[model samples]
Target: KLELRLKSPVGAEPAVYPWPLPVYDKHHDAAHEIIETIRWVCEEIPDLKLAMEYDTKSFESMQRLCDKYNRAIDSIHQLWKGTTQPMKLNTRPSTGLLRHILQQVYNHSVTDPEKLNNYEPFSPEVYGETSFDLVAQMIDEIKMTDDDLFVDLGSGVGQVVLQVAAATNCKHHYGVEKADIPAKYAETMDREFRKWMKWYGKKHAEYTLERGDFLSEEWRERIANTSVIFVNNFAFGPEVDHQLKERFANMKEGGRIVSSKPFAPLNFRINSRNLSDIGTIMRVVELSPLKGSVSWTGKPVSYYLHTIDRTILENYFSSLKNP
Candidate 1:
């Protein structure tokens, strides 16, 4: 046995804000941690900025060079009956949901907001894309079913809704996007992905990618009836939070929600748990979306699963299961 001890208390003045983070809000703790790590590891502590960039230097574009490399490695993929080949990874039969080939063939904007049509003249929230692999992980965790309905508010390119449909048993999947270009691509992707799924012997659900604002009555109604909802609130602030509370408060109990910003526990913004109690209205099951080339800044992206609390009053069903 080894014992080492010293009795002490440590404290500090305050943490400084870096890289467009809110100075202070308990809800923003996760964001602060992320920023702190980046500053410390990337610049202040070491000359390790290269890691953050996934750095490279070559005259040739990665897009042009990668296909040939991926093609060479795709023999393993053919053997495994894997979905598609990826340009970069440590593995050959890359274990991920969406392939680089499919994304290239589909040619929808996964990132760049400028590439897609903008529906907003004024709004605090900005557009960001969630990848297919991330959606697949979410579906795997939620275990949604045919009786369930999945909805994505501000669904850009409609990939999340369509991806959820393709990969899961969700009977009805919906996307509401005000942007015209991405919305159109959502429909196009639906048609194309269906063909891919059919060839792979994969099943999918019926889906609609509509052009509309989620805050409108139509969308509020859409969310009310949904079994699950996904909203990426990268640009949303306090006002949007209030709006979210008001709009989602009436959702059917037992339904589920996933968000970039967690709206529960009545305390810190970050919740890392399999089951989280959401203001007595919902119980969240948080899952980490930390696969592949994840999050924007190499920091964490807070992806939280909020399941509507079915219990009006607590009971000990646990006794039957455990005892």
Candidate 2:
């Protein structure tokens, strides 16, 4: 017959070691180490099966082990719960606006029951208007004229294009976006914006917002007549940046390329050196008159801007006729 006994080891004596002390005393340290090792093996090793015939046993050993395991699980749960608390809004004004907006959109109360004063939402505010101001500043520094056309890549809510149109009298503004939801929102916002402009007697055509990926070959062909291109760091990953540089190489000279985020290697002269003054540190490069290669860090780099020769533009469109 199998038997078990619940008891502390027969000859073992519980030992206490003083803290804030070195472990040079081998006898005191060794006892503590043995106790820790035994506990770790019993609790952590899943398949360490041990059998002992304990002379018709008592149940104390099993009860002690079960209690220790429960305590360990409870400790883990508390640590996880404390670490994963959600971020809370800082001010009461923000709290009410956030709750009201989320409730209108989601059809559910935004306040957390666990913390009645707190609100958590899955989406944070996307600052479309601020992006517009920065893009406009870069365009102005480049001395882009009213005859120049402005193109916004990944234009969310058409804010950048609208700002560009309002500030600079660009001949035309094009906004390209991929997602249907934001594109629809852009359309609604544009309609409302046009009404406001009409009321204020602003002089410019309504901006065009198109639904498409910036990288589509169709977009490349569409912008063949484009005189000035403005890109904010929306979709120009490394590979795409290289491809854009290649495309710009074939464009006519005297054309301008201004980017908020410098991801491409081009030969155009930088009209402005201070990106920090504009509130961002993203590198911006321009390539005027198409060139074959530009170098950085001993590696030949080709990205969004391509050199354009002035002679080519003079021959194609006389300076007086072009701009």
Each model's lDDT comes to 0.56, 0.44
Runs in model 1 lying further than 4 Å from the true structure: 1-105, 108-114, 117-122, 195-202, 266-278, 289-298, 310-323
Off by over 4 Å in 2: 1-132, 263-323
Q: Candidate 1: count the clashes.
A: 1
lDDT of 1 by residue, 1-323 (tens): 21111110011121222333222233323243333323332332121333233111221332233333234223433533566332222211122334432443254323343555364534644667776666767877888877888889888777777666656667788888876677767677766665544432334568887888888877677778888888887667768777876777778878888887777652423223422333556666568656565566776666888877646224323333564
Mark the 10 consecutive residues where model 1 has the least summed lDDT.
3-12
Error of 1 at 223 (Å): 1.1
Candidate 1 lDDT score at position 10: 12
In candidate 2, how many Å is residue 56 off? 82
Predicted candidate 2 versus true structure: per-residue lDDT over 1-323, tens digit per residue? 32221111211222222232223233333223323333433332222213110111223443344345444434433544686432221211122222222222111111122231122232211222223234434544656566777787667567667666655666788988775556766776576555433322234444698888876788776565677776654334556666665555545555656553454323323233522121121223543322343343453332233224444333433534656
Q: What is the TM-score of each candidate against the true structure?
A: 0.57, 0.43
Please give the lDDT score for candidate 2: 0.44
Single out the weakest 10-residue window by summed lDDT for candidate 2: 47-56
